[PDB]
């Protein structure tokens, strides 16, 4: 958090000691669109959200920290 930044961008790294676009909730914002279909992959209907019980637990199928090309 504000280590050696000042140039312009100050979100290149989320407060999670890592890239912002490399986080979940970060990608949950809907910054992806490989297939511009409002989605990419999934197989788990909406429900018990991320502790938000908002009703939407989109299964991160074919889209993880490795399952993004393999299986
Ligand atoms: Zn983040």
How big is the chain, counted in residues?
71
Residue pointed to by tokens 């280590």: 3
Q: What are phi and psi of 18, to 5 degrees?
A: -175, 165
28 C-alpha to ligand 1 centroid (Å): 9
Specify the DSSP class assigned to residue 30: T
Taking the CA atoms of residue 62, residue 50, residue 39 and residue 23 in that order, the dihedral angle to the nearest 10 degrees is -70
* Annotated binding residues: 26, 50-54
The CA radius of gyration of the chain, in Å to the nearest whole number, is 15
SS3 18: strand
62 with 44: CB under 8 angstroms? no
Domain count, the chain: 1
67 C-alpha to ligand 1 centroid (Å): 19
Residue pointed to by tokens 């958090």: 1
**Beta carbons within 10 angstroms of residue 12's beta carbon:** 11
* Annotated binding residues for RNA: 26, 50-54
43 C-alpha to ligand 1 centroid (Å): 24
Experimental method: NMR
Rounded Cα distance between 41 and 61, Å, is 6
């Amino acid at each position: 958090g504000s280590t050696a930044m000042a140039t312009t961008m100050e979100q290149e790294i989320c407060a999670h000691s890592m890239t912002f676009e490399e986080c979940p909730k970060c990608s949950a914002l809907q910054y992806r669109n490989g297939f511009y279909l409002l989605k990419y992959d999934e197989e788990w209907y909406p429900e018990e959200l991320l502790t938000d019980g908002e009703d939407d637990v989109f299964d991160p199928d074919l889209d993880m920290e490795v399952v993004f090309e393999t299986q």
